[PDB]
Paper text:
Na+/H+ antiporters are found in all cells to help regulate intracellular pH, sodium levels, and cell volume. Bacterial [name] is an electrogenic Na+/H+ antiporter that transports 2 H+ in exchange for 1 Na+ across the membrane. EcNhaA is inactive below pH 6.0, and between pH 6.5 and pH 8 transport rates increase 2000-fold.
In the [name] crystal structure at active pH 6.5, Arg81 in TM2 breaks its salt-bridge interaction with Glu252 in TM9 and forms a tighter salt-bridge (>3.3 Å) to Glu78 located on its own helix, stabilized by Glu82 and Glu252 through interactions with Glu78. The concerted movement of Arg81, His256 and Asp11 side-chains at active pH has caused a dramatic widening of the intracellular funnel. Consistently, we find that only at active pH 6.5 is the intracellular funnel in [name] wide enough to accommodate a hydrated Na+ ion to the ion-binding site, as assessed by HOLE analysis. In addition, 106 crystallographic waters were modelled with one of the waters in hydrogen bond distance to the ion-binding Asp163. We further show that the neighbouring Asp163 forms a salt-bridge to Lys300 at both inactive and active pH, but only at active pH do molecular dynamics (MD) simulations show that Na+ binding induces salt-bridge breakage, an essential step in the transport cycle. In contrast, under inactive pH conditions, the cytosolic funnel contracted over the course of the simulation with concomitant changes in salt bridge interactions, preventing Na+ access to the binding site. Taken together, we conclude the pH sensor is rather working as a pH gate, controlling access to the ion-binding site.
Numbering used by the authors: 10 to 384
Write the structure that this text describes.
Amino acid sequence: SDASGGIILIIAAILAMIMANSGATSGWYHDFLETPVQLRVGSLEINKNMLLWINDALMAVFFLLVGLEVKRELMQGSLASLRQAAFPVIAAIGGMIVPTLLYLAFNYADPITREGWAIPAATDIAFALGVLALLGSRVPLALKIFLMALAIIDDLGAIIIIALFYTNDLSMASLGVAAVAIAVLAVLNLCGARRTGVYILVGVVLWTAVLKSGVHATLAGVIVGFFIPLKEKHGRSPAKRLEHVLHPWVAYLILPLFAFANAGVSLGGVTLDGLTSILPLGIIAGMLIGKPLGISLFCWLALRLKLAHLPEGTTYQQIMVVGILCGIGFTMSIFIASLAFGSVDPELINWAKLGILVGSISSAVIGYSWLRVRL
Ligand SMILES: CCCCCCCC/C=C/CCCCCCCC(=O)OC[C@H](O)CO
Ligand SMILES: CCCCCCCC/C=C\CCCCCCCC(=O)OC[C@H](O)CO
């Protein structure tokens, strides 16, 4: 499902680029996405443009899946112990620090564009795993597990740090209702509730309470995915079945719809001097240099001073290639960019997207080349 998921994602992005650039469709594409919307449901109203609504829904579902996965990794997978978590965690710290530092090298003096610091810290898990899948049985499963954990730690870390920066966007009552909802999820888990539906219902309450803040609405999905029990009772667990049923819908519908609504950008007026502007160049440097350099360097240090061990079945060369692949930020990076610039100016988000596209495509091509050499 990895290879076909990546291919369908790329098709949707190409269709977006066609929509945003052809005279027959460009007008409607942009006008529809820009439309202000307010949904009627009692004494509870909220105003957001069409694209933001779409992204909130799609990313709530995607990060519900991310929540299930990270909980499974912390309880059963490669994050279930210090011994196994050391290497992916140190790698993710590097993949966070170095891309941010290279982005801010260009953008720290700009009070507007510095808000996009996390853009090249993101990794498009579907795209990167799809490029891995192109080598088939030559890829050690441990390498895929490593890439998955790395990307999820960086993506969740970005979302969480941004959420902490954005807390002031929520009201006292919103935070209160959210706290009570999270507490209900916790007691449901600790007591032994195993029907997925009850968690989903309390989860939509949590999601609506923090819906004014897109990043918090996204984090709500993670929280719900985290508190759905994973204990294998009689060979069954609601988290396993939910992840299994949800994964195809995310890989084949949610993420392609997101890419179709977000990856299309006009190419008229774009220039070589425009691409070398601080915002797109900071993104490109973060992805093409920051990601592989941070991941490889922090991993090398972890191994040399014996802080961590290579995952069995992998080599350090393979880890370096994964470091390149983690520069494929694509849809996750576009989402981070919408969180930073979405409510500021269309020129900013479009140039951020152009930078993301150059960095992502270049990371994919270079990573696949090195992958063919090493595997
Ligand atoms: C804002 C800060 C960044 C937020 C980043 C979000 C991602 C969180 C997961 C990464 C840490 C992994 C923790 C691994 C801890 C070791 C696990 C352990 O030793 O626990 C033993 C226990 O038996 C277990 O079942
Ligand atoms: C409210 C902030 C709380 C943050 C607590 C996180 C602590 C985790 C540290 C280890 C991972 C490395 C994290 C490095 C994160 C990049 C630096 C950063 O977040 O600051 C960028 C700044 O916003 C540009 O304007």
